[PDB]
Amino acid sequence: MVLSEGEWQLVLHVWAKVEADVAGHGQDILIRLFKSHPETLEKFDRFKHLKTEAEMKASEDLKKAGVTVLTALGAILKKKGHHEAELKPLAQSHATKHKIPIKYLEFISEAIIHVLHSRHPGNFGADAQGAMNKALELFRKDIAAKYKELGYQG
Numbered sequence: 001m002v003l004s005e006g007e008w009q010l011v012l013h014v015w016a017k018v019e020a021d022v023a024g025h026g027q028d029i030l031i032r033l034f035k036s037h038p039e040t041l042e043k044f045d046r047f048k049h050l051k052t053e054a055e056m057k058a059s060e061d062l063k064k065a066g067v068t069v070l071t072a073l074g075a076i077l078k079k080k081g082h083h084e085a086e087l088k089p090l091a092q093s094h095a096t097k098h099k100i101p102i103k104y105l106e107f108i109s110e111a112i113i114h115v116l117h118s119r120h121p122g123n124f125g126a127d128a129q130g131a132m133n134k135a136l137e138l139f140r141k142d143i144a145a146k147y148k149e150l151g152y153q154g
């Protein structure tokens, strides 16, 4: 997977919109993930018992998780694929400690796209959607390779 400078600039332009409200994007993205793929909520011992969207929006623990994933992913995207140093410790923790299947990184990727389109449709058109899909596929491909280096095929 390879992105053009142009495709990287589309990614960073929409990420600028995420950064106008990091915590609120984090909430929307994790709630979409948990509503669309409930099994993923079981991975978060601090908030796996939340059953409603209102309880999810009121949760400090969920809000903090949302900021964690979006600050990390923003930093990775700003590397424009030169993200070996960021992905190594992410693969280590998500493969060996959190036990997150590659399939769940595919789910949260879909949740990111869904929220970007829901919140920013005047801006997140077909070119932005294509470029972001390419950037999240590169992320998936590279972290999947790291998982295999650690002895996890999925």
Ligand code: HEM
Pocket: 040, 041, 043, 044, 046, 068, 069, 070, 072, 073, 089, 090, 093, 094, 098, 100, 104, 105, 108
């Ligand atoms: C774009 C995808 C993701 C990124 C960038 C990301 C990033 C992070 C970071 C930076 C941390 C804290 C440092 C660390 O433990 O490595 C973390 C913790 C964690 N992540 Fe993720 N993550 C992602 C996807 C997921 C998914 C899909 C799940 C579960 C379905 C997950 C579960 C967790 C858990 C359980 C922790 C531990 C949280 C805690 O200590 O309270 N992550 N993630």
